[PDB]
Amino acid sequence: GMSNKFLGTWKLVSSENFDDYMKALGVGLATRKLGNLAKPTVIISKKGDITIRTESTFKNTEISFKLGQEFEETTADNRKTKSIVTLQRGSLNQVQRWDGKETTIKRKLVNGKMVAECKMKGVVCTRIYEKV
Ligand SMILES: CCCCCCCCCCCCCCCC(=O)O
Ligand SMILES: [Cl-]
Ligand SMILES: [Mg+2]
Ligand SMILES: [Mg+2]
């Protein structure tokens, strides 16, 4: 199952190419400006379902799911998606589908950091988090 090394509170330390990723999702300019200034905390826990909670001054989000079971998600930019989280070679892989579009957020552990790779339409964003 998901490694217990994911569990905990993680703080964003680096983000590369977020603005073009948000653009590819359809996010408007003023929201992107705030999204690029945000430094969220991500809290991963498990109590039956796995929960991934994101906290920031601009927006908070939360998803709770079982691996491999499609669920309804509301994203930080207020998309209403059908999403599935899978585990592949230790990476926690989230696909979101809405309005015939798809994006993936792969989260993996690298030397104790958590690396999120976000992909939309060939645009790739990398966000690196350190455990608190
Ligand atoms: C994530 C909260 C702050 C961002 C607010 C701007 C709205 C666009 C959000 C795009 C989806 C977020 C992808 C997050 C990946 C990650 O967990 O690092
Ligand atoms: Cl913030
Ligand atoms: Mg940066
Ligand atoms: Mg950018």
Swiss-Prot record:
It is found in: Cytoplasm. Coiled coil: none annotated. Pfam families: Lipocalin. GO terms for molecular function: cholesterol binding; fatty acid binding. Hexadecanoate binds at R107, R127, I128, Y129. It is linked to Charcot-Marie-Tooth disease, demyelinating, type 1G: An autosomal dominant demyelinating form of Charcot-Marie-Tooth disease, a disorder of the peripheral nervous system, characterized by progressive weakness and atrophy, initially of the peroneal muscles and later of the distal muscles of the arms. Charcot-Marie-Tooth disease is classified in two main groups on the basis of electrophysiologic properties and histopathology: primary peripheral demyelinating neuropathies (designated CMT1 when they are dominantly inherited) and primary peripheral axonal neuropathies (CMT2). P2 protein and myelin basic protein together constitute a major fraction of peripheral nervous system myelin protein. Monomer. This is Myelin P2 protein. It comes from Homo sapiens (Human).
